[PDB]
Structure 1
């Protein structure tokens, strides 16, 4: 009929209607609504500022650029995670602080449906909101889906360790996007009083960080972390970041006389110059030689003193803060294929032996952070089993997957529980049909595999079996129900126990049913080993 025209605080917005077959009420889709002023020029390495009001009707009908990142790695990930039919080719630009909205509400009438803000993952180095289509989830569960974006890599996490460039710019963008929702979502038939944040991987770590951040207080009422939390060391930088700053500065051809000097110099660099720098620093790829403790992984969350007053560990060790329903989950094989492949892991052989194992585990320091003195014990605890070289490789992948997501996730869940807030956990175990062709038939429940069920990929792509079509319907029910009541349960779905003392959790997959004490053994072991 007629293009959707909503009125926001900064001005009228124009969208387009899209009908999901099987549903009458077409969903109103807005692409590219700016939630902050383009962090260009001097605004670089500074908190996001409010957007400028527009005089007439703004057309939110074109996919917004994605924050500057490594185009190759970026598009690759966008194609592997996208839940839509065709992958949308995105553009790169520092001007990327936008968000997309998918509202199934009949805008003609006053609607206040629950809101679900999605924070995409990509190790805080790559990623885009347009990758995740909300058409299905919005219609299928009748909730407003919001996909936001935030500065990545240098642009969003460069910190000099002091006031001259605290850092966490990216995290502040996410908060900024959340404030925008509180002041506008109501015009999109969404209830600003019922906003649920959820993300995968880095997005999960972000969701976890927002949960600990005082700034995010009152900006959301429910949180979900998918394969990633604030205890996922690889994403949270501790200690003196000054050295990393200086290394970047030099790589960017800048002086390092003082923090201010560095920041000023980098603000002079062109988007393009910093993009090259990014590639030079070779992030998201595991260094094989040199000292494993010097292979900086990827700029990340720091303890700026604004967003995070102290390390996550310290923070969660307190029950004096605002608590909300939190759902933390993981997948059967987090380090199954996706991450290992991307990082260009040396596993190219097919199998692995105790000796080469302790070697890789060492070079994998920037990911697991395991002292070289502990390497032996850890290796033995996991590969000490069968003498099967091929199995050691599989047990090795479990080793990493546990230190990065398994143990961290459960630890966070427990603390959220002991804090006195509704906690829920799950373990996605299913191999989507939308997986890559280069993904072994064996790998089931790899990193990001639940993203297809969560975003109803079966209802957008083709070939999904009735089994997958059903699984998706369930997951969305759970997620949506959680967004609503802060409880996944609802008639028509298996019972999902609350992660309390019994530590009950739901095993999601072809066979969905409750269970108890997730990674309980693992958490225990690693806690001791790491306690030196």
Structure 2
């Protein structure tokens, strides 16, 4: 008979699922609410606690994903899911749910390390249910929790003042971690041992939670995969009013005051707000006009409740793993953003492209020829220059900020680890050219045990996933990924040792060292 667990708010019923090679089934619970649905007047306000229920709640069907572009959403889900078949999800504003995969013995009080996954998707798209926790939970004996949080307008609308501070989706992430603290023990999890992990906007979310006083003591280790808060495209600093005014005008609202914009947006239906989103054309490199106006998405702001100062100002202490992939801009991102690419580049085109990429990389027009010349100037081949140009964007968006974050964290005295992931999963899209290796998202298939759920993995890819899961879980359990029978992974100290993970797994030193000196010198 199926597993039934008592939680503070009432009982929940899930399901037992087996995995070849494990004699104990995993108990799976889908669509557990962790907050009141943020509808009606709750739109653009902090999450409220869920109301209790009097009878058993069924937690056996996937929850809706937060409102978002359903085509971009479905497409990102197919690209990143570790399951055999993608699970088609419904859209809704009622999306504050989490899913739990627990291999514990639910009769006997276990206290397994808890890993709370935060999905990516630029804070605009994405879903928890894309990520099946079964393989990680069963192989490594940890409770996997996948969470959702408000996206896009619903998640990040900000007037830059007290009428709509912003960061609703981050406060959701915080409320899901409070829920874990209060309830995970009934699922066989140790609330005394919670690791947050996430990729891309999810990695940026981990990073913001590492910086935020609201999240202090709701987790004990942190992992950012390909995304941190510092200097990110996902962080909006200075005056955010002009974006709020455009969103309100696009929705047909007056812009007379902040409170007027918020109240009027609060009267719109889900559909009207989705139509507004559609008209703003987020997540597309805008090729027309002055690149300084282009507005690629909504994001984190400095709201004064979750974040008090800019990441850079705070910079000036849990174990923290910060990693990046070898080709962060190799394919997936330029292809989701409609980057204009022949697959070759002369220097002048490269400059115009970089200038157009201003909202992604923020390089002043005066500095464009220098920057371009630095990355492209060593070679003749316009095919290579194209590669070197993709390298440049990757380093600015991901490689440099991640290494700057890791160094500041190390210097503040906390345990720090870094990796650079370099592997071509056999689960890549068929449209992805062979030469792309360690694209954005490539490490998800290892971390989530896709070789144990999907067909066709090579022997090497199977062993790669076992090793990455074991490092991840050893880090969840001990704040140090090392253990018997694994390559040594050095702590990121003054030597800046890091692990190269993938096709040939080995320790190395000084990740992005010369890049960080170059960009830092350039911007200051």
TM-score interval, normalised by the smaller of the two chains: over 0.9
Correspondence 1:315-394 to 2 at 5 A: 315-317=314-316, 323-347=317-341, 349-394=342-387
C-alpha distance in 2, partners of 1:518/1:10?
47
Q: Could you list the per-position Cα deviations for residues 146-180 of structure 1 after superposition, in whole angstroms to 9, with x for gaps in the alignment?
A: 00000000000000000000000000000000000
1:320 maps to: none
Quote how far apart the aligned CAs of 1:93 are: 0.2
Q: Secondary structure, in 3 states, of the residue corresponding to 2:418?
A: strand
Q: Secondary structure, in 3 states, of the residue corresponding to 1:294?
A: coil
Quote how far apart the aligned CAs of 1:511 are: 0.5
C-alpha distance in 2, partners of 1:239/1:104?
46
C-alpha distance in 2, partners of 1:361/1:409?
21
C-alpha distance in 1, partners of 2:152/2:378?
40
C-alpha distance in 1, partners of 2:110/2:129?
25
Q: Could you list the per-position Cα deviations for residues 87-119 of structure 1 after superposition, in whole angstroms to 9, with x for gaps in the alignment?
A: 000000000000000000010111000000000
| Unaligned residue ranges in structure 2 (runs of 5+) | none
Give TM-score, length-normalised by structure 1: 0.98
Q: Secondary structure, in 3 states, of the residue corresponding to 2:115?
A: strand
Quote how far apart the aligned CAs of 1:233 are: 1.9
1:181 correspondence with 2:156: no
Check whether the contact 1:507–1:513 (CA below 8 A) recurs between aligned residues: yes
Quote how far apart the aligned CAs of 1:417 are: 0.2
Check whether the contact 1:205–1:232 (CA below 8 A) recurs between aligned residues: no
Q: Could you list the per-position Cα deviations for residues 406-453 of structure 1 after superposition, in whole angstroms to 9, with x for gaps in the alignment?
A: 000000000000000000000000000000011010000000000000
Quote how far apart the aligned CAs of 1:480 are: 0.2
Quote how far apart the aligned CAs of 1:385 are: 1.4
2:161 maps to: 162
C-alpha distance in 2, partners of 1:498/1:80?
32
C-alpha distance in 2, partners of 1:148/1:315?
27
C-alpha distance in 1, partners of 2:23/2:511?
41
C-alpha distance in 2, partners of 1:276/1:530?
38
Q: Could you list the per-position Cα deviations for residues 222-252 of structure 1 after superposition, in whole angstroms to 9, with x for gaps in the alignment?
A: 0000000011420000010001000000001
C-alpha distance in 2, partners of 1:371/1:185?
48
Q: Secondary structure, in 3 states, of the residue corresponding to 2:197?
A: strand
Figure out how many residues of one structure are paired with residues of the other and give that number.
524
Correspondence 1:490-501 to 2 at 5 A: 490-501=483-494
Q: Secondary structure, in 3 states, of the residue corresponding to 2:44?
A: coil
C-alpha distance in 1, partners of 2:28/2:258?
43
Check whether the contact 1:325–1:423 (CA below 8 A) recurs between aligned residues: yes
1:483 correspondence with 2:482: no
C-alpha distance in 1, partners of 2:275/2:425?
35
Check whether the contact 1:357–1:379 (CA below 8 A) recurs between aligned residues: yes
C-alpha distance in 2, partners of 1:442/1:253?
47
Quote how far apart the aligned CAs of 1:316 are: 1.6
Give TM-score, length-normalised by structure 2: 1.00
Quote how far apart the aligned CAs of 1:84 are: 0.6
C-alpha distance in 2, partners of 1:53/1:450?
38
Quote how far apart the aligned CAs of 1:492 are: 1.1
Q: Could you list the per-position Cα deviations for residues 165-201 of structure 1 after superposition, in whole angstroms to 9, with x for gaps in the alignment?
A: 0000000000000000000000000000000000000
C-alpha distance in 2, partners of 1:328/1:336?
20
Quote how far apart the aligned CAs of 1:286 are: 0.4
> Which of 396, 400, 403 is matched with 1:407 structurally?
400
Quote how far apart the aligned CAs of 1:38 are: 0.3
Q: Secondary structure, in 3 states, of the residue corresponding to 1:234?
A: coil
C-alpha distance in 2, partners of 1:370/1:297?
16
Q: Could you list the per-position Cα deviations for residues 271-292 of structure 1 after superposition, in whole angstroms to 9, with x for gaps in the alignment?
A: 0000011011000110001110
C-alpha distance in 1, partners of 2:454/2:315?
40
Check whether the contact 1:232–1:405 (CA below 8 A) recurs between aligned residues: no
Check whether the contact 1:32–1:60 (CA below 8 A) recurs between aligned residues: yes
C-alpha distance in 2, partners of 1:202/1:353?
32
> Which of 460, 467, 470 is matched with 1:474 structurally?
467
Q: Secondary structure, in 3 states, of the residue corresponding to 1:345?
A: coil
C-alpha distance in 1, partners of 2:238/2:250?
21
Q: Could you list the per-position Cα deviations for residues 298-349 of structure 1 after superposition, in whole angstroms to 9, with x for gaps in the alignment?
A: 11000000000000011122xxxxx1000000000000000000100001x1
Quote how far apart the aligned CAs of 1:297 are: 1.3
CA RMSD of the aligned region, Å?
0.5
Quote how far apart the aligned CAs of 1:69 are: 0.2
C-alpha distance in 2, partners of 1:129/1:530?
37
C-alpha distance in 1, partners of 2:287/2:424?
30
Q: Could you list the per-position Cα deviations for residues 16-75 of structure 1 after superposition, in whole angstroms to 9, with x for gaps in the alignment?
A: 000111001100000000000000000000000000101100000000000000001000
Check whether the contact 1:67–1:150 (CA below 8 A) recurs between aligned residues: yes
Q: Secondary structure, in 3 states, of the residue corresponding to 2:504?
A: coil
C-alpha distance in 1, partners of 2:72/2:159?
26
Check whether the contact 1:115–1:145 (CA below 8 A) recurs between aligned residues: yes
Quote how far apart the aligned CAs of 1:404 are: 0.3
Q: Which moved more, 1:226-235 or 1:402-411?
A: 226-235
Quote how far apart the aligned CAs of 1:120 are: 0.1
- The structure 1 segments of at least 4 consecutive aligned residues displaced by more than 3 Å after TM superposition are none
> Which of 508, 511, 526 is matched with 2:519 structurally?
526
Check whether the contact 1:424–1:499 (CA below 8 A) recurs between aligned residues: yes
Q: Secondary structure, in 3 states, of the residue corresponding to 1:508?
A: strand
C-alpha distance in 1, partners of 2:109/2:61?
26
Q: Which moved more, 1:183-192 or 1:229-238?
A: 229-238
